[PDB]
Amino acid sequence: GIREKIKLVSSAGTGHFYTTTKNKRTKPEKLELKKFDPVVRQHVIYKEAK
Amino acid sequence: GFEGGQMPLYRRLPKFGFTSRKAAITAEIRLSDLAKVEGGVVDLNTLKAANIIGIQIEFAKVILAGEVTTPVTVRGLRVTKGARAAIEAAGGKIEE
Amino acid sequence: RNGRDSEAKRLGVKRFGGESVLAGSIIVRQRGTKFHAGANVGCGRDHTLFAKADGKVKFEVKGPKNRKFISIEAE
Amino acid sequence: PKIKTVRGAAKRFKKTGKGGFKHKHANLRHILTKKATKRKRHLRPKAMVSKGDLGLVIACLPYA
RNA sequence: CCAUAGGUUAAUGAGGCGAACCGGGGGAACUGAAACAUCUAAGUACCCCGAGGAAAAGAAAUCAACCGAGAUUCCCCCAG
RNA sequence: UUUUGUAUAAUGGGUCAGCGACUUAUAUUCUGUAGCAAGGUUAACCGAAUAGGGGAGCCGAAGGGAAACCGAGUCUUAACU
RNA sequence: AGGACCGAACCGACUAAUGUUGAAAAAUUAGCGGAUGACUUGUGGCUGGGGGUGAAAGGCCAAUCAAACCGGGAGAUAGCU
RNA sequence: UGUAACGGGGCUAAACCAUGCACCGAAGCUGCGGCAGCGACGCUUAUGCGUUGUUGGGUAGGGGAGCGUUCUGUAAGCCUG
RNA sequence: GUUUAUUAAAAACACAGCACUGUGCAAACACGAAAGUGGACGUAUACGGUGUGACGCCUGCCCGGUGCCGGAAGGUUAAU
RNA sequence: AAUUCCUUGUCGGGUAAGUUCCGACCUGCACGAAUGGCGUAAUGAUGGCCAGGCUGUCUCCACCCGAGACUCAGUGAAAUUGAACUCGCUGUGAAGAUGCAGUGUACCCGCGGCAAGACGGAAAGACCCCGUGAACCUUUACUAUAGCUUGACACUGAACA
RNA sequence: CUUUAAUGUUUGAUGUUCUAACGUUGACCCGUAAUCCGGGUUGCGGACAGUGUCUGGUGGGUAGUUUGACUGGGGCGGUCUCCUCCUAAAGAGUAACGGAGGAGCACGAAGGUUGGCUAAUCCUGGUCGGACAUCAGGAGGUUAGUGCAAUGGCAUAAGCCAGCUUGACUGCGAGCGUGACGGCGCGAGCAGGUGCGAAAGCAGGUCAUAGUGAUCCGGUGGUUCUGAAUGGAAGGGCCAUC
What we know:
This is part of a larger assembly, with chains A, B, C and D. Chain A is 0% helix and 48% strand. Chain A is an all-beta fold. Chain D: InterPro entries: Ribosomal_bL35, Ribosomal_bL35-like, Ribosomal_bL35_CS, Ribosomal_bL35_sf.
């Protein structure tokens, strides 16, 4: 519905991204989640609420 | 491949891959041959001459697939591990 | 105004009492916890009860609420 | 004549060592962020064509 | 005006027919796609021009691949 | 003949006689059978010409992988109980 | 004088009956309309198929017309009989 | 349309109820004779029998085994004025 | 008057008359790959198209929609 | 009203009696002004209604004259047709029986005649439905295209402001 | 460099004028005893018109086609996928244009964990204060709640509140369930790295069951896997994803 799709990109040098959905209207703030990076193999901070 | 009008099996499944261009010029030599090469020396020619790989073939490989007996000198062909041991065990010589 | 129903979900008891199971086997695919998990039985996310060790299925009635457990006897 | 291969079937099935055919799983091209990673991880390896369907496949692929 | 157009005469050749094969100029649709329009049928049917006992093509501004082959045409593979 | 079901008042046939409908070619798969057998077999063509040559090729003896590549293993994966 | 009036030839075809395996694949008999006109007729010519021609009915184009006839594509196709 | 709601005659039992013993009754079962399929089993061994058990309705359809026709070889043979 | 030759002759078609509209002549328009031809050896009192349909009394309001005619400022807008 | 469903509207005229006809009213389902409105003399093998005359149209048919029909001689078809030793009823039955069951009736064979049945004959129902059938027709369905139309380049230049 | 002034020069733009291309279905002459045509002279028009290629617009004038199925005949109406209950005959499944309802999402907390807590309603007392807003006590028992239908669940709470958080992880997966298949679902455990907790442990989303779309074609990021002489590249593959 209204809830958009975003890419959580990795803070390490890799291009690896998780992908998910955000309500852009009610939460306009960016979304930072310490997720797992399998190219670095380490839990790195992910950014970019699209 | 007509299932009534349902989307057929060869058309509801995705397609994968590509064709190599290079696997059509590689070959795969057993050890049952190379007693057939007339010489005790094995190159791409000496195999082509023995009607065993084909004229278009550029790469060849000497897979363990059974029972080398005579001492054979393999030249310029890739040899697998097990068949390196089998060629070198029955006299034999592998240079590249 | 009517004429619709969902597809039948095929719930129920898949392995009955005394029936020998392997580990991992689903015993009761069900909807709440009509049957609860007992010894060597796990309860999945959709309240599917599955054999966590090998053995025999044991339906029992335990506890102060007369709940229907499902154990597995080691066999 | 000589039998023509159903050509878009050759791009989708590949013959194996004992005559069965492997194929890539469906459902893993797009709409993907809605799917669990357990689905997607179980759809990546290639799979054998089942018993029902080998008749159709062998009919479409007579040289492979 | 010179001259060209035109006119008259003579010499040589052509014209038309013919079954298929051949080269070229044009060129469908039914059909198949379980509908249909891209696609197919198919450069097929047909129409037209021209030629020969055959025609056409043909003597690398061609391939190949760091080795080489050596014009065109036809057949069997390559290879569904 | 078609049908759930035809004496059916459902279809067909006035009768006789003659003709009248699962073929042919080329590929592929399985069964039988024959030859040879880790090998089998040639096509075009040459031709004393159904012989004999012709093994170009095709199929099989090795798979895995999208592919490079590896190879009785291989792919997945950083690595696999 | 008159797309004037009555009415034969001439052109037509309103009604009825017969006929309907007819005398006739459209007629006969008894009445009927026009009958100097936008009439009728002979002989020749011209227009052609998505085309002609049409005082228009989808009428007519060789007893064929919401697309002639012949030949070909062609054994079109027919999940239907 | 005609009795026309026992098939009919006809029945006061030839109706109904209860009990019992008879008999009729099918391509069922049995008897006698025959053929064929599938098993098992001692030989026969390349199969037949002293056997022996059991099976044999059949549409779509699958499997197996045959007869006839015309033509070629056997056949310049063998029948035939 | 004409029409469904062969089940419909009619209120239908036609018609004189009316109106609208196009057309300045190498006319519009039509047949025609084109040449050309008809329009017409005519010239706007003519010709083509469309509707209505002798005559008499008349033909009212609506330009928002669709079309046509006219305008060129601005927006958008192809090949290049 | 060629227009009006309700509707045989209501009133009037004609008729013994009038769903039609004529006149009128107007509540015009759903007239109406050049897809013309309303009148309209004459005309019409035009539509509707009334009357005089006339009559076999009819009450209700009768007789007669001819041509067939019928008999004889000659010639000599056709559609149809599984086979027939081809009755009624009542019931059964693929549900409307010459063929089944029960029963009743009926010597065998023709000729003239009638047409109730043989789901009679003729024509692979024209209606209805179906077919991923066809054809023509329409349109602001889709896709094209002829035609008309727009600009660029070509054919296609100079001399001055 | 910025900004300006004069000249020369280099090119485009526009308007007037011109004759020389082209048009002439104007006149005259000739081929020619010819209203065709061609040539000549001249007049008029004249870079226009016209035609070719390209291009926008218009285009039933014409052509090719499409215009669903279910359906107690077809049309009209309704429906078409997914979830819940009943029908459904005490395993599963089970039809009808049978009876009833819902979905085409929401959520970065409404997920994970740790620690804690327990509802509805009614009665009584009490400032504004009321049938019903807060307080206190009692009865009561989950008649409540569960992000949204219904069913099954839920107190060990799956309900309610707070602290810290990202396991809403990545690669796999014994074994099962469920479908004709495509597919869908459940999953202990293994490896890597993480959160909460003192720890045992729990966490691969949410109490569960709806919240959806195959393939092709193509877009974006990563990975030399390929890369038609060779080195690259383009394109393709693979992984993620739209």
